[PDB]
Symmetry: C2
C-alpha cells in the first residue's frame, strides 16, 4: 500500500511571508530594547504600500517605519517592477497600546484560549516530514542564492516564488517510509531578460539536485518549473499579503495538525506561538528518545488559566514495546511544564530570536538559539 | 484507550471572522451581478477602520463601502464602546483590476495556483463532523442567533465578540472515535457594562450550553468556564486587529484532519484553496455516509495552470469496511469524482452568490440546501 502526499513552501519574498518577516522584525526590534515587551503586530501589503497594525506595549523606542523599509530592502524589493520598492512605498503605521492578585511565574495565565499542536517523525534527521523538508529546502536555497549569489549568475532572480513536493510513501506499522520523489513543482519570479528554458536548467542543476537526495529521484520524477508561463510580475503588486496566511508552511506541510493560530508578530505570552513551540519540543523529544517513530501532541488553554485545559499524545501505533500513549502522557507530565510562565523561561522566548523563524519554517531548524529543536532524552 | 481533545469556534463579531464575512459579502455582491467574476478580496481591521484590499475582475457595479457598512451593521457593531461603529468607521477600498491562450474546454481549465487541500469526515455526529467542532460551533452560532434575533430586554446586553472551546473525552477503537463525555466547556462572551458575569454565567449555561450540548454527555464533573478571567466589555477591532483568513481551523475541522493552509473567504471558485477543499469534503463525507469507513481524510494538490491534480490521497485510519482499503477507495474516487477545477466548479454550483453564509459558523457540517459539498453521494 503506497500513497502520494504533498507539501509546499514559499519564498521569503512571497507577499504573505514578507508580512510575517516584517511582523517578526518589529517584534525583535522591541525585544532587543525591552524583553518584557507585549507585541501583536500584524502586517498587510498590496501595490505600493505596507501597513503595520495591532497593539504593542513596550519601553523600546523603535522607528517602525525604518524597520519596515530595511526588512523589505533586505528581501530584495527595490523596484516597482519587482512588485514593490522599499524606497517609494507608502508605510502606514497603526499601532496602539485595575488590581490583580500578586502572581509567581507558575501562576501566570495563558493570554488567550486555543489549542496548539506539535509533531515529529523519524523520516528525516530534522525529525520532520520529508515532503516539508524538501519543499522548504528548495525555497530556502533559492532565497540564499538570490540574496547571496553573484549578479552575473543569479541577478535575474526576483523575490517571489513557491515550491511543492510530492513524495510517494509506504507505511509499515504506522512508520512512514519514503519510497521516491514523485513530483517537484517550483515557481520562481524572474527579470524579463531571461527565458523560462534557461531558468529550468538553473533550478534543476543548482537547486533541485543540490537539496533533493539523488537516491529518491528517478527518470519518472515529474519536474515542473514555471509550467504555466513566465513569472515576471509578482510580489505585492501581483497578490496582496497579510501576516499569518502561511501557517502550514510555518509548521508541518499538512502533516500532523494545526490549531489555527499564527506565529509572527506575537511575543511569547501568545500561547499560539509558545505553546506550539513547546508542543514541538515534546513531540521531537519523544521521537528522538526512540519511544515512537511519529508523534502528535495537542495542548489547549483557557484565557487567564495557567495550567492547560487539556493535553493529548498520539503515536499512530508506532510506540515502542512497553509504551502506549497513556504512559507517554504520564511521562510528558513528569518532565514538561506547559504553564506559560514556565515555558517562556525554559525556551528563552523573551530573546530577539524571531525574525529568523519567519521564513524557512519554524520547525526542523538547526539554529542554536531555537531551544524547541533541542530534544530531551525521555524514558 | 481514552484521551482528551479540544476544538474552538468564535462569534461572528470576532474581528478576524468579521473580516471573513466582509470578504465574502463582497464576493457575493459581485457574483449576484456577474457569475464570472474573479475575486481575491482581503479585509483588515483595527480601531475605527476597515480596509479592503486585493484584486477583483468583474462586470458588477458594487458599492463596496456600502456593502462593508451594511455587513458590519448586521453583525451589530453600531457603537464605539462595542469596539466598532459602522456609522463612523473609516472604510478604505484598495482593490485593483488585473496573452494569447490556446482555446480551452471546461475539462482543460488549469488550477489558478498550486497548493494542497484536505477534506475530512467522521461518523461521530449526524453532520459527519468531529463532536468537539460541532459543539464549539453550536455554542458560538447560538450566541450569535440570540443576539442578532432575540428580544432586547433578554439579550440586549450581548455584544458581538466571543469564543468557545470544547474538550471532549474520547475512546478510540480501531480508529473509530466514540465520544465518552464532555470534559470542559469554555465560553468567552462580550457584554455591556451593566450586566455582571454572574448573571451571564447563568444565561449562557441555561440558554446556550444546555440547549446545544447533549445532556447524556454532560455530568457533574464537566468543567464549565464562562468569562473565567473577568469581565469582557472591551472587544472587537478596538481590542484586537482582524484579518481575512486567520480562522482557517474554525472554518474547517477544529484541529481534526489536516489543513493545506489556504483561506476560503474573499475567494471566487477558481481559487482551488476553496473549491478543492469543498470537493475534498464532499469526497470524505460521501465515503463515510456510504458506510465504507468511519473516518476519512482526503488530500488533493494542484499545480498552477494544470487541470488535473498533481496528487490525490485517501486515509481511512484503519476504519475501512471489509473488502475496502485505501487503495481501492482511491480507485472508486477516481471513477466518480473529478477534481479538474472547471468541472468541480460547475458540479458544486460555485458561481452562485452562496458564500456569505459560509463565512461564520464553519464551512462544513452545514445543512443549507445551497451547499452541494454537504450532499453526499452513495459509493461502492
Ligand atoms: Mg496569500
Ligand atoms: Mg487564536
Ligand atoms: Mg486573530
Ligand atoms: Mg495559498
Amino acid at each position: 500500500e503506497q500513497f502520494l502526499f504533498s507539501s509546499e513552501s514559499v519564498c521569503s519574498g512571497h507577499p504573505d511571508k514578507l508580512c510575517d518577516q516584517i511582523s517578526d522584525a518589529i517584534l525583535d526590534a522591541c525585544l532587543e530594547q525591552d524583553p518584557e515587551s507585549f507585541v501583536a503586530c500584524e502586517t498587510c501589503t498590496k501595490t505600493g504600500f505596507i501597513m503595520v497594525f495591532g497593539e504593542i506595549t513596550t519601553k523600546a523606542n523603535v522607528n517602525y517605519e525604518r524597520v519596515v523599509r530595511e526588512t523589505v530592502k533586505e528581501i530584495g524589493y527595490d523596484s516597482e517592477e519587482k512588485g514593490l520598492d522599499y524606497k517609494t512605498m507608502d508605510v502606514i503605521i497603526k499601532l496602539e497600546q485595575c488590581v490583580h492578585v500578586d502572581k509567581n511565574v507558575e501562576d501566570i495565565g495563558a493570554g488567550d484560549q486555543g489549542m496548539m499542536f506539535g509533531y515529529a517523525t523519524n523520516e528525516t534527521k530534522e525529525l520532520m516530514p520529508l515532503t516539508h523538508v524538501l519543499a522548504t529546502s528548495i525555497t530556502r536555497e533559492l532565497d540564499y542564492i538570490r540574496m547571496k549569489g553573484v549578479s552575473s549568475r543569479v541577478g535575474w532572480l526576483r523575490p517571489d516564488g513557491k515550491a511543492q513536493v510530492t513524495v510517494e510513501y509506504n507505511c509499515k506499522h504506522g512508520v512512514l517510509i519514503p519510497k521516491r520523489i514523485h513530483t517537484i513543482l517550483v515557481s520562481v519570479q524572474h527579470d524579463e531578460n531571461i527565458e523560462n528554458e534557461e531558468i529550468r536548467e538553473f533550478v534543476l542543476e543548482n537547486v533541485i539536485k543540490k537539496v533533493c537526495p539523488s537516491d529518491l529521484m528517478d527518470k519518472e520524477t515529474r519536474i515542473l518549473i514555471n509550467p504555466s508561463g513566465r513569472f515576471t510580475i509578482g510580489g505585492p503588486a501581483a497578490d496582496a499579503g497579510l501576516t499569518g496566511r502561511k501557517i502550514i508552511v510555518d509548521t508541518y506541510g499538512g502533516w500532523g495538525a494545526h490549531g489555527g493560530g499564527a506565529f509572527s508578530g506575537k511575543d511569547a505570552t501568545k500561547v499560539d506561538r509558545s505553546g506550539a513551540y513547546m508542543a514541538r519540543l515534546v513531540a521531537k523529544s519523544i521521537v528522538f528518545s526512540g519511544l515512537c517513530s511519529r508523534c502528535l501532541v495537542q495542548v489547549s488553554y483557557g484565557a487567564g488559566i495557567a495550567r492547560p485545559l487539556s493535553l493529548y499524545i498520539n503515536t499512530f501505533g508506532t510506540a515502542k514495546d512497553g509504551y502506549n500513549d497513556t504512559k507517554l502522557l504520564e511521562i510528558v507530565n513528569k518532565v514538561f511544564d506547559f504553564r506559560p510562565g514556565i515555558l517562556i523561561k525554559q525556551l528563552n522566548l523573551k530573546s530577539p530570536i524571531f525574525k529568523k523563524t519567519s521564513s524557512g519554517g519554524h520547525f526542523g531548524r538547526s539554529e542554536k538559539e531555537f531551544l524547541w529543536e533541542k530534544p530531551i532524552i525521555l524514558q
